Design an enzyme around this catalytic site. Structure first.
Site, PDB file in Angstrom:
ATOM      1  N   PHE A  55       0.833  -1.232   0.000  1.00 48.15           N
ATOM      2  CA  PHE A  55       0.000   0.000   0.000  1.00 48.15           C
ATOM      3  C   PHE A  55       0.861   1.273   0.000  1.00 48.15           C
ATOM      4  O   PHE A  55       0.477   2.213  -0.710  1.00 48.15           O
ATOM      5  CB  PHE A  55      -0.962  -0.008   1.194  1.00 48.15           C
ATOM      6  CG  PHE A  55      -2.066  -1.036   1.120  1.00 48.15           C
ATOM      7  CD1 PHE A  55      -3.220  -0.793   0.408  1.00 48.15           C
ATOM      8  CD2 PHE A  55      -1.918  -2.272   1.746  1.00 48.15           C
ATOM      9  CE1 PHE A  55      -4.227  -1.750   0.334  1.00 48.15           C
ATOM     10  CE2 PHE A  55      -2.924  -3.220   1.683  1.00 48.15           C
ATOM     11  CZ  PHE A  55      -4.089  -2.954   0.977  1.00 48.15           C
ATOM     12  N   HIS A 124      -7.927  -7.337   9.201  1.00 43.21           N
ATOM     13  CA  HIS A 124      -8.565  -6.509   8.142  1.00 43.21           C
ATOM     14  C   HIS A 124      -9.458  -7.380   7.252  1.00 43.21           C
ATOM     15  O   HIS A 124     -10.060  -6.845   6.297  1.00 43.21           O
ATOM     16  CB  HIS A 124      -7.500  -5.691   7.377  1.00 43.21           C
ATOM     17  CG  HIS A 124      -6.646  -4.842   8.270  1.00 43.21           C
ATOM     18  ND1 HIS A 124      -5.489  -4.148   7.828  1.00 43.21           N
ATOM     19  CD2 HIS A 124      -6.829  -4.477   9.552  1.00 43.21           C
ATOM     20  CE1 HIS A 124      -4.993  -3.507   8.839  1.00 43.21           C
ATOM     21  NE2 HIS A 124      -5.810  -3.671   9.892  1.00 43.21           N
ATOM     22  N   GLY A 198       7.266  -6.633   6.910  1.00 42.82           N
ATOM     23  CA  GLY A 198       6.651  -5.873   5.822  1.00 42.82           C
ATOM     24  C   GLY A 198       5.360  -5.200   6.241  1.00 42.82           C
ATOM     25  O   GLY A 198       4.433  -5.323   5.527  1.00 42.82           O
ATOM     26  N   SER A 200       4.367  -1.064   7.690  1.00 36.30           N
ATOM     27  CA  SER A 200       4.866   0.267   8.106  1.00 36.30           C
ATOM     28  C   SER A 200       4.251   0.651   9.457  1.00 36.30           C
ATOM     29  O   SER A 200       4.668   1.688   9.997  1.00 36.30           O
ATOM     30  CB  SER A 200       4.601   1.303   7.033  1.00 36.30           C
ATOM     31  OG  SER A 200       3.220   1.499   6.882  1.00 36.30           O
ATOM     32  N   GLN A 226      11.285   0.119   4.354  1.00 37.14           N
ATOM     33  CA  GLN A 226      11.015   1.531   4.671  1.00 37.14           C
ATOM     34  C   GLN A 226      11.048   1.699   6.189  1.00 37.14           C
ATOM     35  O   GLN A 226      10.905   0.711   6.951  1.00 37.14           O
ATOM     36  CB  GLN A 226       9.630   1.968   4.192  1.00 37.14           C
ATOM     37  CG  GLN A 226       9.472   2.107   2.685  1.00 37.14           C
ATOM     38  CD  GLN A 226       8.063   2.454   2.259  1.00 37.14           C
ATOM     39  OE1 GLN A 226       7.046   1.985   2.793  1.00 37.14           O
ATOM     40  NE2 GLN A 226       7.968   3.310   1.258  1.00 37.14           N
ATOM     41  N   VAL A 242      12.176  -9.344   3.210  1.00 39.55           N
ATOM     42  CA  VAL A 242      11.674 -10.272   4.241  1.00 39.55           C
ATOM     43  C   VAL A 242      12.039 -11.702   3.830  1.00 39.55           C
ATOM     44  O   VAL A 242      12.441 -12.411   4.696  1.00 39.55           O
ATOM     45  CB  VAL A 242      10.191 -10.093   4.580  1.00 39.55           C
ATOM     46  CG1 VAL A 242       9.267 -10.480   3.434  1.00 39.55           C
ATOM     47  CG2 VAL A 242       9.831 -10.836   5.848  1.00 39.55           C
TER      48      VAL A 242
HETATM   49  N1  LIG Z   1      10.038  -7.717   0.166  1.00 36.68           N
HETATM   50  C1  LIG Z   1       9.942  -6.856   1.173  1.00 36.68           C
HETATM   51  N2  LIG Z   1      10.765  -6.993   2.243  1.00 36.68           N
HETATM   52  C2  LIG Z   1      10.655  -6.101   3.242  1.00 36.68           C
HETATM   53  N3  LIG Z   1       9.823  -5.062   3.362  1.00 36.68           N
HETATM   54  C3  LIG Z   1       9.018  -4.965   2.299  1.00 36.68           C
HETATM   55  C4  LIG Z   1       9.035  -5.774   1.182  1.00 36.68           C
HETATM   56  N4  LIG Z   1       8.071  -5.353   0.303  1.00 36.68           N
HETATM   57  C5  LIG Z   1       7.496  -4.326   0.884  1.00 36.68           C
HETATM   58  N5  LIG Z   1       8.052  -4.018   2.075  1.00 36.68           N
HETATM   59  C6  LIG Z   1       7.688  -2.992   3.017  1.00 36.68           C
HETATM   60  O1  LIG Z   1       6.484  -3.415   3.572  1.00 36.68           O
HETATM   61  C7  LIG Z   1       5.768  -2.294   4.126  1.00 36.68           C
HETATM   62  C8  LIG Z   1       4.299  -2.549   3.953  1.00 36.68           C
HETATM   63  O2  LIG Z   1       3.581  -1.381   4.422  1.00 36.68           O
HETATM   64  P1  LIG Z   1       2.169  -0.894   3.886  1.00 36.68           P
HETATM   65  O3  LIG Z   1       2.232  -0.890   2.401  1.00 36.68           O
HETATM   66  O4  LIG Z   1       1.735   0.255   4.705  1.00 36.68           O
HETATM   67  O5  LIG Z   1       1.208  -2.122   4.357  1.00 36.68           O
HETATM   68  P2  LIG Z   1       0.547  -2.537   5.776  1.00 36.68           P
HETATM   69  O6  LIG Z   1       0.141  -4.004   5.781  1.00 36.68           O
HETATM   70  O7  LIG Z   1       1.383  -2.085   6.904  1.00 36.68           O
HETATM   71  O8  LIG Z   1      -0.766  -1.673   5.644  1.00 36.68           O
HETATM   72  C9  LIG Z   1      -1.756  -1.695   6.707  1.00 36.68           C
HETATM   73  C10 LIG Z   1      -3.129  -1.492   6.114  1.00 36.68           C
HETATM   74  O9  LIG Z   1      -3.182  -0.217   5.395  1.00 36.68           O
HETATM   75  C11 LIG Z   1      -4.060  -0.340   4.289  1.00 36.68           C
HETATM   76  O10 LIG Z   1      -4.944   0.747   4.264  1.00 36.68           O
HETATM   77  C12 LIG Z   1      -4.727  -1.727   4.461  1.00 36.68           C
HETATM   78  O11 LIG Z   1      -5.932  -1.693   5.213  1.00 36.68           O
HETATM   79  C13 LIG Z   1      -3.614  -2.544   5.119  1.00 36.68           C
HETATM   80  O12 LIG Z   1      -4.005  -3.799   5.712  1.00 36.68           O
HETATM   81  C14 LIG Z   1       6.309  -1.054   3.390  1.00 36.68           C
HETATM   82  O13 LIG Z   1       6.696  -0.111   4.366  1.00 36.68           O
HETATM   83  C15 LIG Z   1       7.431  -1.587   2.477  1.00 36.68           C
HETATM   84  O14 LIG Z   1       8.649  -0.904   2.533  1.00 36.68           O
HETATM   85  C1  LIG Z   2      -2.767  -4.955  -1.775  1.00 35.06           C
HETATM   86  C2  LIG Z   2      -4.178  -5.436  -1.673  1.00 35.06           C
HETATM   87  O1  LIG Z   2      -4.533  -6.303  -0.894  1.00 35.06           O
HETATM   88  N1  LIG Z   2      -5.063  -4.802  -2.490  1.00 35.06           N
HETATM   89  C3  LIG Z   2      -6.397  -5.127  -2.620  1.00 35.06           C
HETATM   90  C4  LIG Z   2      -7.149  -5.878  -1.694  1.00 35.06           C
HETATM   91  C5  LIG Z   2      -8.431  -6.093  -2.119  1.00 35.06           C
HETATM   92  S1  LIG Z   2      -8.803  -5.278  -3.572  1.00 35.06           S
HETATM   93  C6  LIG Z   2      -7.185  -4.710  -3.685  1.00 35.06           C
HETATM   94  C7  LIG Z   2      -6.760  -3.869  -4.818  1.00 35.06           C
HETATM   95  O2  LIG Z   2      -5.620  -3.438  -4.789  1.00 35.06           O
HETATM   96  O3  LIG Z   2      -7.555  -3.677  -5.715  1.00 35.06           O
HETATM   97 CL   LIG Z   3      -7.886  -1.155  -2.741  1.00 36.43          CL
END
Ligand SMILES: Nc1ncnc2c1ncn2[C@@H]1O[C@H](COP(=O)(O)OP(=O)(O)OC[C@H]2O[C@H](O)[C@H](O)[C@@H]2O)[C@@H](O)[C@H]1O
Ligand SMILES: CC(=O)Nc1ccsc1C(=O)O
Ligand SMILES: [Cl-]
Ligand SMILES: [Cl-]
Ligand SMILES: [Zn+2]
EC number: 2.3.1.-
Length: 282
Positions: A55, A124, A198, A200, A226, A242
């Site tokens: 995301f 979620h 993975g 934030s 990040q 990861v």
């Molecule tokens: N291969 C990898 N190795 C390590 N880190 C990684 C990799 N790929 C990505 N990242 C890091 O992985 C991190 C992923 O952060 P985010 O993208 O915020 O995802 P969340 O699960 O915390 O988002 C929470 C909710 O927000 C939404 O609204 C939904 O409701 C979600 O469920 C980044 O900081 C990348 O640098």
């Molecule tokens: C990253 C991810 O789960 N995206 C998601 C989840 C349900 S729909 C959707 C999208 O990116 O369209």
């Molecule tokens: Cl989405």
């Protein structure tokens, strides 16, 4: 929804140089060996290496939206394979080194990997999971349930009920499932190690759960490319993929990453399998 706070998006990636990365994953292995109760916290970053965009990463769904661009999927949700990281998390539960898995991911990959649902909080929701409004009975489908935002799917409960089945995907206004959150919260409080992979850690209360481990002297490891909301609170921050971290960690723990037999649902955790004897640490 339109105005929803999507947080800090597209922050720069950090890469620990190899020597530092090697040293940190050994230290992580030390912490896993010392730890009575290990809780793992997973977000979108553990599914990027299976073609699912995150995301808030540089090509994140929200990041790309902010720059007028589109995230890109290299798989469907149905044709997505559990990553090395997913399969390493299955083994750690099997050998008794993972007490509980808390995930923010809706991609269904933990369930589909064979990870036992009684040790998984899906905070979620899950794109493959629909739930009966009447009896609360959950169904794990082989295809994504066509709806999001706790909407009627069109299918009915088959419990020996004809209840309305709805998706489990929270919209911005929907509060977390009380069962999953209660169990994620209990595991996080009782943990002496929380490892984040993975995420934030920007979403409340999901992102805050690892901090609850710090209460009564628990240790917090953050694995993320990040910066994350709680970097300041971590005993160890590992900046690398990861999959590289978990494959070096498994190698240190003397464990194989198990083969993926394709999509398989496991409701209930089995008794622990045998694992290697622990090193002399001190
Ligand atoms: N291969 C990898 N190795 C390590 N880190 C990684 C990799 N790929 C990505 N990242 C890091 O992985 C991190 C992923 O952060 P985010 O993208 O915020 O995802 P969340 O699960 O915390 O988002 C929470 C909710 O927000 C939404 O609204 C939904 O409701 C979600 O469920 C980044 O900081 C990348 O640098
Ligand atoms: C990253 C991810 O789960 N995206 C998601 C989840 C349900 S729909 C959707 C999208 O990116 O369209
Ligand atoms: Cl989405
Ligand atoms: Cl939604
Ligand atoms: Zn029902």
């Amino acid at each position: 929804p339109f105005t929803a706070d999507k947080g800090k998006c597209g922050l720069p990636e950090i890469f620990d140089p190899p020597e530092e990365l090697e040293r940190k994953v050994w230290e992580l292995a030390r912490l896993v060996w010392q730890s009575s109760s290990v809780v793992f916290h997973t977000g979108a970053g553990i599914s990027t290496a299976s073609g699912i965009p995150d995301f808030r990463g540089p090509h994140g769904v929200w990041t790309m939206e902010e720059r007028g661009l589109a995230p890109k999927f290299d798989t469907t949700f149905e044709s997505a394979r559990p990553t090395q990281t997913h399969m390493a998390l299955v083994q750690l539960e099997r050998v008794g080194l993972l007490r509980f898995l808390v995930s923010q991911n809706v991609d269904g990959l933990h369930v589909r990997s064979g990870f036992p649902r009684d040790k998984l909080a899906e905070l979620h929701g899950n794109m493959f999971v629909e739930e009966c409004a009447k009896c609360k009975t959950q169904y794990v489908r082989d295809t994504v349930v066509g709806t999001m935002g706790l909407k009627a799917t069109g299918r009915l409960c088959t419990v020996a009920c004809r209840g309305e089945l709805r998706d489990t995907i929270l919209d911005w206004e929907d509060s977390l499932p009380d069962r999953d959150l209660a169990l994620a919260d209990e595991a996080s409080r009782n943990a002496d190690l929380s490892i984040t992979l993975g995420t934030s850690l920007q979403i409340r209360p999901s992102g805050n759960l690892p901090l609850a481990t710090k209460r009564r002297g628990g240790r917090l490891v953050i694995v993320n490319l990040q910066p994350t909301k709680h970097d300041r609170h971590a005993d160890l921050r590992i900046h690398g993929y990861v999959d590289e971290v978990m494959t070096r960690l498994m190698k240190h723990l003397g464990l194989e990453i198990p083969a993926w037999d394709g999509p398989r649902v496991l409701e209930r955790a089995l008794p622990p399998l045998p694992r290697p004897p622990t090193p002399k640490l001190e």
